[PDB]
Design an enzyme around this catalytic site. Structure first.
Site, PDB file in Angstrom:
ATOM      1  N   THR A 155       0.692  -1.175   0.116  1.00  0.00           N
ATOM      2  CA  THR A 155       0.007   0.052   0.005  1.00  0.00           C
ATOM      3  C   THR A 155       0.690   1.264  -0.064  1.00  0.00           C
ATOM      4  N   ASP A 257      -9.445  -4.243  -0.017  1.00  0.00           N
ATOM      5  CA  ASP A 257      -8.082  -4.986   0.609  1.00  0.00           C
ATOM      6  C   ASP A 257      -8.450  -5.539   1.830  1.00  0.00           C
ATOM      7  N   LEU A 685      21.392   4.013 -13.453  1.00  0.00           N
ATOM      8  CA  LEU A 685      21.940   4.890 -14.294  1.00  0.00           C
ATOM      9  C   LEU A 685      23.378   4.804 -14.584  1.00  0.00           C
TER      10      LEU A 685
HETATM   11  C1  LIG Z   1      13.998   8.398 -10.727  1.00  0.00           C
HETATM   12  O1  LIG Z   1      13.589   9.948 -10.917  1.00  0.00           O
HETATM   13  C2  LIG Z   1      14.498  10.568  -9.544  1.00  0.00           C
HETATM   14  C3  LIG Z   1      14.037  12.012  -9.731  1.00  0.00           C
HETATM   15  O2  LIG Z   1      14.457  12.510 -10.910  1.00  0.00           O
HETATM   16  C4  LIG Z   1      15.877  10.469  -9.923  1.00  0.00           C
HETATM   17  O3  LIG Z   1      16.641  10.693  -8.697  1.00  0.00           O
HETATM   18  C5  LIG Z   1      17.434  11.829  -8.632  1.00  0.00           C
HETATM   19  O4  LIG Z   1      18.687  11.197  -9.058  1.00  0.00           O
HETATM   20  C6  LIG Z   1      19.736  12.442  -9.432  1.00  0.00           C
HETATM   21  C7  LIG Z   1      20.975  11.577  -9.777  1.00  0.00           C
HETATM   22  O5  LIG Z   1      21.285  10.565  -8.838  1.00  0.00           O
HETATM   23  C8  LIG Z   1      19.733  13.044  -8.075  1.00  0.00           C
HETATM   24  O6  LIG Z   1      20.737  13.974  -8.278  1.00  0.00           O
HETATM   25  C9  LIG Z   1      21.581  14.234  -6.662  1.00  0.00           C
HETATM   26  O7  LIG Z   1      21.004  15.117  -5.986  1.00  0.00           O
HETATM   27  C10 LIG Z   1      21.713  15.592  -4.870  1.00  0.00           C
HETATM   28  C11 LIG Z   1      20.654  16.636  -4.303  1.00  0.00           C
HETATM   29  O8  LIG Z   1      19.860  15.864  -3.703  1.00  0.00           O
HETATM   30  C12 LIG Z   1      18.990  16.273  -2.587  1.00  0.00           C
HETATM   31  O9  LIG Z   1      18.024  17.520  -2.982  1.00  0.00           O
HETATM   32  C13 LIG Z   1      17.144  17.096  -4.043  1.00  0.00           C
HETATM   33  C14 LIG Z   1      16.417  18.215  -4.546  1.00  0.00           C
HETATM   34  O10 LIG Z   1      15.222  18.628  -3.602  1.00  0.00           O
HETATM   35  C15 LIG Z   1      16.258  15.990  -3.468  1.00  0.00           C
HETATM   36  O11 LIG Z   1      15.462  15.388  -4.364  1.00  0.00           O
HETATM   37  C16 LIG Z   1      17.061  14.706  -2.937  1.00  0.00           C
HETATM   38  O12 LIG Z   1      15.997  13.784  -2.142  1.00  0.00           O
HETATM   39  C17 LIG Z   1      16.850  12.375  -1.825  1.00  0.00           C
HETATM   40  O13 LIG Z   1      17.249  12.344  -0.606  1.00  0.00           O
HETATM   41  C18 LIG Z   1      16.373  12.695   0.531  1.00  0.00           C
HETATM   42  C19 LIG Z   1      16.987  12.582   1.800  1.00  0.00           C
HETATM   43  O14 LIG Z   1      17.388  13.957   2.214  1.00  0.00           O
HETATM   44  C20 LIG Z   1      15.304  11.414   0.488  1.00  0.00           C
HETATM   45  O15 LIG Z   1      14.147  11.850   1.459  1.00  0.00           O
HETATM   46  C21 LIG Z   1      14.636  11.238  -0.770  1.00  0.00           C
HETATM   47  O16 LIG Z   1      13.763  10.079  -0.937  1.00  0.00           O
HETATM   48  C22 LIG Z   1      15.661  11.286  -2.087  1.00  0.00           C
HETATM   49  O17 LIG Z   1      16.557  10.053  -1.751  1.00  0.00           O
HETATM   50  C23 LIG Z   1      16.918   9.190  -3.081  1.00  0.00           C
HETATM   51  O18 LIG Z   1      17.896   9.993  -3.849  1.00  0.00           O
HETATM   52  C24 LIG Z   1      19.496  10.007  -3.208  1.00  0.00           C
HETATM   53  C25 LIG Z   1      20.299  10.822  -4.069  1.00  0.00           C
HETATM   54  O19 LIG Z   1      20.061  12.236  -4.144  1.00  0.00           O
HETATM   55  C26 LIG Z   1      19.750   8.572  -2.816  1.00  0.00           C
HETATM   56  O20 LIG Z   1      20.858   8.495  -2.180  1.00  0.00           O
HETATM   57  C27 LIG Z   1      18.603   7.775  -2.187  1.00  0.00           C
HETATM   58  O21 LIG Z   1      18.849   6.567  -1.904  1.00  0.00           O
HETATM   59  C28 LIG Z   1      17.243   7.897  -2.866  1.00  0.00           C
HETATM   60  O22 LIG Z   1      17.284   6.965  -4.116  1.00  0.00           O
HETATM   61  C29 LIG Z   1      18.029  15.193  -1.975  1.00  0.00           C
HETATM   62  O23 LIG Z   1      17.594  15.603  -0.621  1.00  0.00           O
HETATM   63  C30 LIG Z   1      23.101  15.981  -5.091  1.00  0.00           C
HETATM   64  O24 LIG Z   1      24.138  16.262  -4.107  1.00  0.00           O
HETATM   65  C31 LIG Z   1      23.837  15.181  -6.217  1.00  0.00           C
HETATM   66  O25 LIG Z   1      25.086  15.737  -6.839  1.00  0.00           O
HETATM   67  C32 LIG Z   1      26.329  15.098  -6.579  1.00  0.00           C
HETATM   68  O26 LIG Z   1      26.831  14.446  -8.047  1.00  0.00           O
HETATM   69  C33 LIG Z   1      27.322  15.562  -9.108  1.00  0.00           C
HETATM   70  C34 LIG Z   1      28.564  14.954  -9.902  1.00  0.00           C
HETATM   71  O27 LIG Z   1      28.784  15.775 -10.785  1.00  0.00           O
HETATM   72  C35 LIG Z   1      28.028  16.850  -8.341  1.00  0.00           C
HETATM   73  O28 LIG Z   1      27.710  17.927  -9.263  1.00  0.00           O
HETATM   74  C36 LIG Z   1      27.443  17.267  -7.043  1.00  0.00           C
HETATM   75  O29 LIG Z   1      28.159  18.392  -6.676  1.00  0.00           O
HETATM   76  C37 LIG Z   1      27.419  16.030  -6.186  1.00  0.00           C
HETATM   77  O30 LIG Z   1      28.691  15.637  -5.927  1.00  0.00           O
HETATM   78  C38 LIG Z   1      29.208  15.690  -4.589  1.00  0.00           C
HETATM   79  O31 LIG Z   1      28.548  14.941  -3.848  1.00  0.00           O
HETATM   80  C39 LIG Z   1      28.602  13.571  -4.079  1.00  0.00           C
HETATM   81  C40 LIG Z   1      27.401  12.926  -3.375  1.00  0.00           C
HETATM   82  O32 LIG Z   1      27.189  13.174  -2.039  1.00  0.00           O
HETATM   83  C41 LIG Z   1      30.186  13.220  -3.677  1.00  0.00           C
HETATM   84  O33 LIG Z   1      30.391  11.836  -3.702  1.00  0.00           O
HETATM   85  C42 LIG Z   1      31.025  14.137  -4.565  1.00  0.00           C
HETATM   86  O34 LIG Z   1      32.425  13.569  -4.023  1.00  0.00           O
HETATM   87  C43 LIG Z   1      30.840  15.496  -4.732  1.00  0.00           C
HETATM   88  O35 LIG Z   1      31.575  16.114  -3.725  1.00  0.00           O
HETATM   89  C44 LIG Z   1      22.911  14.515  -7.336  1.00  0.00           C
HETATM   90  O36 LIG Z   1      22.718  15.861  -8.248  1.00  0.00           O
HETATM   91  C45 LIG Z   1      18.476  13.473  -7.408  1.00  0.00           C
HETATM   92  O37 LIG Z   1      18.405  13.787  -6.033  1.00  0.00           O
HETATM   93  C46 LIG Z   1      17.482  12.576  -7.159  1.00  0.00           C
HETATM   94  N1  LIG Z   1      16.164  12.821  -6.845  1.00  0.00           N
HETATM   95  C47 LIG Z   1      15.278  11.980  -6.143  1.00  0.00           C
HETATM   96  C48 LIG Z   1      14.117  12.587  -5.785  1.00  0.00           C
HETATM   97  O38 LIG Z   1      15.392  10.744  -5.680  1.00  0.00           O
HETATM   98  C49 LIG Z   1      16.305   9.017 -10.284  1.00  0.00           C
HETATM   99  O39 LIG Z   1      17.665   8.798 -10.814  1.00  0.00           O
HETATM  100  C50 LIG Z   1      15.260   8.385 -11.329  1.00  0.00           C
HETATM  101  N2  LIG Z   1      15.673   6.933 -11.671  1.00  0.00           N
HETATM  102  C51 LIG Z   1      15.846   6.451 -12.615  1.00  0.00           C
HETATM  103  C52 LIG Z   1      16.042   4.914 -12.861  1.00  0.00           C
HETATM  104  O40 LIG Z   1      15.853   6.939 -13.620  1.00  0.00           O
HETATM  105  C1  LIG Z   2      -3.017   2.589   5.923  1.00  0.00           C
HETATM  106  N1  LIG Z   2      -3.463   3.935   5.154  1.00  0.00           N
HETATM  107  C2  LIG Z   2      -3.495   3.633   3.666  1.00  0.00           C
HETATM  108  C3  LIG Z   2      -3.726   5.004   2.781  1.00  0.00           C
HETATM  109  N2  LIG Z   2      -4.319   5.899   3.454  1.00  0.00           N
HETATM  110  C4  LIG Z   2      -4.777   5.895   5.012  1.00  0.00           C
HETATM  111  C5  LIG Z   2      -5.807   6.833   5.032  1.00  0.00           C
HETATM  112  N3  LIG Z   2      -5.804   7.513   4.057  1.00  0.00           N
HETATM  113  C6  LIG Z   2      -5.228   7.058   2.883  1.00  0.00           C
HETATM  114  C7  LIG Z   2      -4.726   7.612   1.717  1.00  0.00           C
HETATM  115  O1  LIG Z   2      -3.626   7.996   1.285  1.00  0.00           O
HETATM  116  C8  LIG Z   2      -3.411   8.493  -0.175  1.00  0.00           C
HETATM  117  C9  LIG Z   2      -4.335   8.435  -1.056  1.00  0.00           C
HETATM  118  C10 LIG Z   2      -3.877   8.740  -2.206  1.00  0.00           C
HETATM  119 CL1  LIG Z   2      -5.038   8.480  -3.640  1.00  0.00          CL
HETATM  120  C11 LIG Z   2      -2.664   9.136  -2.679  1.00  0.00           C
HETATM  121  C12 LIG Z   2      -2.400   9.431  -3.962  1.00  0.00           C
HETATM  122  N4  LIG Z   2      -1.963  10.078  -5.085  1.00  0.00           N
HETATM  123  C13 LIG Z   2      -1.574   9.064  -1.653  1.00  0.00           C
HETATM  124  C14 LIG Z   2      -2.089   8.893  -0.345  1.00  0.00           C
HETATM  125  C15 LIG Z   2      -1.004   8.634   0.469  1.00  0.00           C
HETATM  126  C16 LIG Z   2      -0.776   7.545   1.620  1.00  0.00           C
HETATM  127  C17 LIG Z   2      -1.054  10.117   1.906  1.00  0.00           C
HETATM  128  C18 LIG Z   2       0.663   8.958   0.240  1.00  0.00           C
HETATM  129  C19 LIG Z   2      -4.228   4.828   5.684  1.00  0.00           C
HETATM  130  O2  LIG Z   2      -4.857   4.705   6.864  1.00  0.00           O
HETATM  131 CA   LIG Z   3      -3.187  -1.567  -0.439  1.00  0.00          CA
HETATM  132 CA   LIG Z   4      25.108   3.578 -11.866  1.00  0.00          CA
HETATM  133 ZN   LIG Z   5      -3.386  -5.497   2.136  1.00  0.00          ZN
END
Ligand SMILES: *[C@@H]1O[C@H](CO)[C@@H](O[C@@H]2O[C@H](CO)[C@@H](O[C@@H]3O[C@H](CO[C@H]4O[C@H](CO)[C@@H](O)[C@H](O[C@H]5O[C@H](CO)[C@@H](O)[C@H](O)[C@@H]5O[C@H]5O[C@H](CO)[C@@H](O)[C@H](O)[C@@H]5O)[C@@H]4O)[C@@H](O)[C@H](O[C@H]4O[C@H](CO)[C@@H](O)[C@H](O)[C@@H]4O[C@H]4O[C@H](CO)[C@@H](O)[C@H](O)[C@@H]4O)[C@@H]3O)[C@H](O)[C@H]2NC(C)=O)[C@H](O)[C@H]1NC(C)=O
Ligand SMILES: CN1CCn2c(cnc2COc2cc(Cl)c(C#N)cc2C(C)(C)C)C1=O
Ligand SMILES: [Ca+2]
Ligand SMILES: [Ca+2]
Ligand SMILES: [Zn+2]
Ligand SMILES: [K+]
Ligand code: NA
Length: 801
Positions: A155, A257, A685
């Site tokens: 979910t 569900d 990637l």
């Molecule tokens: C699916 O789609 C998504 C979205 O488009 C793609 O994900 C993106 O991938 C990009 C490339 O990997 C990535 O870009 C990086 O961003 C870093 C900054 O990120 C922060 O801010 C953004 C913007 O708001 C935010 O989205 C990020 O969110 C992540 O982290 C938070 C935790 O705080 C999580 O809550 C969230 O779920 C998310 O996690 C996911 O992504 C991170 C990585 O960002 C993963 O580690 C997690 O597992 C999870 O998958 C962040 O809060 C930025 O710092 C990176 O830049 C580095 O690299 C370049 C290299 O040239 C350089 O220019 C930069 O300076 C930096 O290098 C330096 O730092 C390095 C790393 O620390 C270090 O090793 C070096 O030595 C250097 O000094 C990079 O630009 C983008 O963040 C994510 N976005 C999301 C939402 O995930 C994804 O790829 C797609 N998938 C496919 C298969 O296509």
């Molecule tokens: C256990 N559990 C399940 C989900 N749930 C509950 C109460 N209400 C919701 C519904 O939540 C959603 C409904 C929609 Cl349609 C979308 C989209 N897009 C996203 C959410 C999240 C979850 C907030 C990300 C609850 O108790």
């Molecule tokens: Ca469900």
């Molecule tokens: Ca790779």
């Molecule tokens: Zn279920």
């Protein structure tokens, strides 16, 4: 004298200890004193009756049948039916909605997301007789036969994917239960930690909307708010004035569900939950009709996942495999995630755990993986919340650590969570409204695509996400998103003959001293690209990053050869239905030939492979399919060679020698593009050169983590692949480049008993290969770009209908 009056179901969440009147007061145990009396009225239930018609508005009542209810927007949903002789929406004939028919002051059509937990795809057909309202939406609107959830098919991962367009590994909700070792905190269904904002990454639709000036209703509803009240609240919000009325709303139902878990997906008890959900749909549609919004609002009817038959007797116990079972923590059920019970245990070794879980019982109902070895289509690795060891569980089974865990808790007949290509896990999509097409059925698609579409419906710019924007334009009457093909970053070189044979010292022999002028111009023309139109059907792929590479032309195949990775990024060839397979002559068995277009310094060498006792080599264009004995020599060029483990060569050889020709026979020719993938950090990637962890011994030759192929033909199979007038058909694979076949429990048998099952498990979208390679395919077709985007998101799942 608590203060909820006037503020019932507030949109601007206020700050405690100033008391709350919204869907997260109940979830925080901190409602204003009078929430239940004011905001959960139930007196007289949810339906007008003849004797209530024209009543004296009495504010104790759940909903109203007084004259003034409509401009107030708080009539019971059947008021015009009962008190004005209007018809139920479900009884009116379908009429095309060509334009939004909205009250003045509406600046865009509102969107209502109607999400139904555990609504398995096959319920649309199997329950059609008991869901008339839903059946009207489906038949009158735009629907798919099913919609693919994300893995795991749970979910929270799925609903948060719907909200964000992101894979779980990117948004961070990787399961219904999770441990984050960075926070040292646990996320659970029961309890309060799940509400902390650090779990929830990306940008969900309600934030995207708000940041761009578009107001949103609540997405998370308390389980204590009855469904009828959620509906009435939405209808009340829709009656607000222009500057306060939200434009996006969500309704969530815990059914089917909740009952599917108890009764199984098709238990006789499931008919009633399906009827109840349909009634709730009818309430919404009748309610919108009373407000003259039934031809104004866009409605999305969507599930999060399906439901499979699972009983407590189909449980696998890790205590039957592991002597050391108390030293691990398992996240159990329809998937398995394993980590050390204590990170101070220096004994804990994941490889010995994997080994002890691998092919130990003859019909073992789970398979262990290091998470980087999971099929890449699952995109389930790049998050620290995903444990290194994963168990993929067969449909209909559970895994647990020890038998006590399953008998201190058979209580259930249904569950979900399995691999997202499993038919029972598929869910639903219907779109109904002015922006959706009329009476249109679209092919199955993935729920990661919907965020973009919801943004298109609302006039919003989506945050970066994993959907492919434009791939679902065919669902939409208007507001389509028209993207441009990404610009090529690196132009190819086109090397001619530039090196003499004696410049190469490769340790490579080819016993080929086998020397006309009609034929000599012929060979030259092939090298200059004269057959390229045959083998490169859809243009060359574009390279979307900075690099150095060469286009190499040959009679039977063309390639884009990387000077950096010392091998092709892609090799492209067309096999007609009539092609003949031949076998490698003995004068060519261990033959590798210098390519006089490419310098020795940008070439592989055979000595490295000789020296590397674990690594051998194969070819991207298969020598078995060469068009003539003269052309066969091209297949032995050093520039068509790639590193391959011997265990992998069994897979690859069967694919090239048997399967390609089989596919050409079945599909009336195929075009094949093959190549290496390097994803050492399992982020889905393309790796840069500095990320590569393994090389052929003593060399600069990098070792791919995976090998891909994209197999394209004409959707109308009466046209040959090379002379196709219309839409295309594709299947692709991303095969793991592994030094053993431990993944395939039947691998001691002949390849005809196990290789194709391996390839099916590793089926892939073209779009997956694009991320992994930095290539853009299908650049020159005669098809619309949106149609091509749809093609690139297609996954061949190999499930029955
Ligand atoms: C699916 O789609 C998504 C979205 O488009 C793609 O994900 C993106 O991938 C990009 C490339 O990997 C990535 O870009 C990086 O961003 C870093 C900054 O990120 C922060 O801010 C953004 C913007 O708001 C935010 O989205 C990020 O969110 C992540 O982290 C938070 C935790 O705080 C999580 O809550 C969230 O779920 C998310 O996690 C996911 O992504 C991170 C990585 O960002 C993963 O580690 C997690 O597992 C999870 O998958 C962040 O809060 C930025 O710092 C990176 O830049 C580095 O690299 C370049 C290299 O040239 C350089 O220019 C930069 O300076 C930096 O290098 C330096 O730092 C390095 C790393 O620390 C270090 O090793 C070096 O030595 C250097 O000094 C990079 O630009 C983008 O963040 C994510 N976005 C999301 C939402 O995930 C994804 O790829 C797609 N998938 C496919 C298969 O296509
Ligand atoms: C256990 N559990 C399940 C989900 N749930 C509950 C109460 N209400 C919701 C519904 O939540 C959603 C409904 C929609 Cl349609 C979308 C989209 N897009 C996203 C959410 C999240 C979850 C907030 C990300 C609850 O108790
Ligand atoms: Ca469900
Ligand atoms: Ca790779
Ligand atoms: Zn279920
Ligand atoms: K070797
Ligand atoms: Na095996």
């Amino acid at each position: 004298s608590g203060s909820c009056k006037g503020r019932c179901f507030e949109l601007q969440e206020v700050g405690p200890p100033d008391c709350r009147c919204d869907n997260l007061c109940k979830s925080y145990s901190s409602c204003c004193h009078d929430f239940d009396e004011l905001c959960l009225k139930t007196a007289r239930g949810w339906e007008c009756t003849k004797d209530r018609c024209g009543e004296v508005r009495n504010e104790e009542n759940a909903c109203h049948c007084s004259e003034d209810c409509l401009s107030r927007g708080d009539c019971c949903t059947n008021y015009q039916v009962v008190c004005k002789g209007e018809s139920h929406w479900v009884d009116d004939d379908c009429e095309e909605i060509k334009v939004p028919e909205c009250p003045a002051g509406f600046v865009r059509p509102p969107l209502i997301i109607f999400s139904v937990d555990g609504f398995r795809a096959s319920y649309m057909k199997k329950g059609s007789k008991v869901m008339p309202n839903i059946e009207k939406l489906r038949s009158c609107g735009t629907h798919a036969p099913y919609m693919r959830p994300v893995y795991p098919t749970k979910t929270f991962p799925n609903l948060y994917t719907l909200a964000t367009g992101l894979y779980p590994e990117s948004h961070g909700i990787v399961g219904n239960s999770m441990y984050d070792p960075v926070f040292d905190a646990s996320f659970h269904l029961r309890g309060r930690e799940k509400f902390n904002h650090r779990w929830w990454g990306g940008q969900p639709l309600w934030i995207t909307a708000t940041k761009q000036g578009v107001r949103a209703g609540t997405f998370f509803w308390s389980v204590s708010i009855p469904h009828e009240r959620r509906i009435l609240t939405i209808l009340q919000w829709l009656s607000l004035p222009d500057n306060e009325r939200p434009s996006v709303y969500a309704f969530y139902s815990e059914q089917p569900d909740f009952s599917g878990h108890k009764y199984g997906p098709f238990g006789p008890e499931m008919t009633n939950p399906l009827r109840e959900i349909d009634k709730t749909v009818g309430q919404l549609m009748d309610g919108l009709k009373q407000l003259r919004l039934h031809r104004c609002v866009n409605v999305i009817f969507v599930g999060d996942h399906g439901m499979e038959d699972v009983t407590c007797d189909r449980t696998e116990f890790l205590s039957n495999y592991l002597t050391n079972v108390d030293d691990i923590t398992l996240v159990p059920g329809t998937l398995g995630r394993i980590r050390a019970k204590s990170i101070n245990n220096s004994k804990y070794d994941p490889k010995t755990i994997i080994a002890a879980l691998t092919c130990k019982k003859p019909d073992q109902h789970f398979k262990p993986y290091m998470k980087q070895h999971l099929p890449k289509r699952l995109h389930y690795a790049n998050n620290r919340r995903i444990e290194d060891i994963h168990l993929l569980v067969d449909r209909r089974w559970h895994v647990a650590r020890k038998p006590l865990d399953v008998y201190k808790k058979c209580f259930f007949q249904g569950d979900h969570g399995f691999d997202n290509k499993v038919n029972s896990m598929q869910t639903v999509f219907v779109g109904y409204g002015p922006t959706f097409k009329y009476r249109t059925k679209v092919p199955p698609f993935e729920n990661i695509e919907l965020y973009n579409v919801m943004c298109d419906l609302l006039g919003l710019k989506p945050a970066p996400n994993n959907g492919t924007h434009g791939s679902l334009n065919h669902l939409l009457r208007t507001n389509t998103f028209r993207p441009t093909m990404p610009d090529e970053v690196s132009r190819p070189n086109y090397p001619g003959i530039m090196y003499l044979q004696s410049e190469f010292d490769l340790g490579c022999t080819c016993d080929d001293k086998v020397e006309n002028k009609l034929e000599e111009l012929n060979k030259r023309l092939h090298t200059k690209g004269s057959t390229k139109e045959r083998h490169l059907l859809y243009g060359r792929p574009a390279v979307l990053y900075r690099t150095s590479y060469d286009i190499l032309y040959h009679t039977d195949f063309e390639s884009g050869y990387s000077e950096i990775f010392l091998m092709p990024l892609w090799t492209s060839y067309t096999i007609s239905k009539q092609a003949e397979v031949s076998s490698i002559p003995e004068h060519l068995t261990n033959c590798v030939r210098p390519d006089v277009r490419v310098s020795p310094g940008f070439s592989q060498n055979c000595l490295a492979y000789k020296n590397d006792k674990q690594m051998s080599y194969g070819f991207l264009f298969p020598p078995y399919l060469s068009s003539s004995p003269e052309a066969k020599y091209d297949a032995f060029l050093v520039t068509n060679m790639v590193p391959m483990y011997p265990a992998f060569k069994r897979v690859w050889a069967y694919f090239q020698r048997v399967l390609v020709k089989k596919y050409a026979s079945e599909r009336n020719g195929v075009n094949v593009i093959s190549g290496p993938i390097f994803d050492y950090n399992y982020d889905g990637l393309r790796d840069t050169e500095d990320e590569i962890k393994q090389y052929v011994e003593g060399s600069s030759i990098p070792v791919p983590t995976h090998y891909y192929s994209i197999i394209t033909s004409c959707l109308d199979f009466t046209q040959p692949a090379d002379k196709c007038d219309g839409p295309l058909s594709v299947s692709s694979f991303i095969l793991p480049h592994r030094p053993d076949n431990d993944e395939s429990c039947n691998s001691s048998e002949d390849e005809s008993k196990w290789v194709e099952e391996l390839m099916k498990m590793h089926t892939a979208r073209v779009r997956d290969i694009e991320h992994l390679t930095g290539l853009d395919f299908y650049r020159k077709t005669s098809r619309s770009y949106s149609e091509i985007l749809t093609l690139k998101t297609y996954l061949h799942t190999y499930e029955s209908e």
